[PDB]
Amino acid sequence: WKDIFDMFYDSKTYANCIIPTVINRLYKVSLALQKDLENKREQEKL
């Protein structure tokens, strides 16, 4: 798979191209899901 990437979808620019892609998810589906849920957790008791 690394060769799959690096053949021509390579240089990490393609990765850095895709890096934007689902950076939404980290808060679109992950950090909105959690730190809003952990702003509960972390402040749930203490």
From Swiss-Prot:
Top-level lineage group: Eukaryota
Location in the cell: Nucleus, Nucleolus
Subunit details: Interacts with the ADA3/NGG1 subunit of the SAGA complex. Interacts with KRR1.
Additional remark text: Present with 350 molecules/cell in log phase SD medium.
Known function: Probable ubiquitin ligase protein involved in many cellular processes, such as transcription regulation, maintenance of nuclear structure, cell cycle, mRNA export and rRNA maturation. E3 ubiquitin ligase proteins mediate ubiquitination and subsequent proteasomal degradation of target proteins. Involved in transcription regulation by interacting, and probably mediating, ubiquitination of some subunit of the SAGA complex. Required for SPT7 ubiquitination. Participates in mRNA export from the nucleus by regulating the transport of hnRNP proteins.
Family from the record: Belongs to the UPL family. TOM1/PTR1 subfamily.
Protein name: E3 ubiquitin-protein ligase TOM1
Taxonomic classification: Eukaryota, Fungi, Dikarya, Ascomycota, Saccharomycotina
